[PDB]
């Protein structure tokens, strides 16, 4: 089972959804499609 750790890396594009980081925008965009794309466990409030 996956684990949890701190300090992943600083990138010019962070995912306010989960907290991920992508050196490039195009990337963060393809990832965010996972939050709005489906209906996970409470993605966001507003
Ligand atoms: Zn995310």
Swiss-Prot record:
Tissue: Overexpressed in ovarian cancer tissues compared to normal ovarian tissues. Isoform 1 and isoform 2 are expressed in squamous epithelium tissues. Isoform 2 is overexpressed in squamous cervical cancer (at protein level). Expressed in blood cells. Isoform 1 is expressed in pancreas, lung, skeletal muscle, heart, placenta, liver, kidney and brain. Isoform 2 expressed in chronic lymphocytic leukemia (CLL) and several tumor cell lines. Isoform 3 is expressed in several tumor cells. Isoform 5 is expressed in fetal liver and several tumor cells.
Superkingdom per UniProt: Eukaryota
Induction conditions: Down-regulated during erythroid differentiation by GATA1. Down-regulated by HTLV-1 Tax through the CREB/ATF pathway. Up-regulated by the regulator of nonsense transcript UPF1. Up-regulated by the cyclic AMP-dependent transcription factor ATF4.
ZnF locations on chain (C2H2-type): 13-35
Domain remark from Swiss-Prot or TrEMBL: The KRAB domain functions to reinforce the nuclear localization of isoform 1 in addition to its transcription repression activity.
Assembly behavior: Interacts (via the KRAB domain) with TRIM28 (via the RBCC domain); the interaction increases ZNF268 nuclear localization activity. Isoform 2 interacts with CHUK and IKBKB; the interaction is further increased in a TNF-alpha-dependent manner. Forms a ternary complex with TBK1 and SETD4; the interaction between SETD4 and TBK1 is ZNF268-dependent and leads to TBK1 monomethylation.
Annotated family: Belongs to the krueppel C2H2-type zinc-finger protein family.
UniProt function note: Involved in the regulation of antiviral interferon signaling. During viral infection, recruits SETD4 to TBK1, leading to TBK1 monomethylation, which is critical for the assembly of TBK1 complex and IRF3 signaling.
Protein's cellular compartments: Cytoplasm
Annotated protein name in UniProt: Zinc finger protein 268
């Amino acid at each position: 089972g996956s684990s949890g750790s701190s300090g992943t890396g600083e990138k010019p594009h962070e995912c306010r959804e989960c907290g991920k980081s992508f050196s490039f925008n195009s990337q963060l965009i393809v990832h965010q499609r996972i939050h709005t794309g489906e209906n996970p466990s409470g993605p966001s409030s507003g």
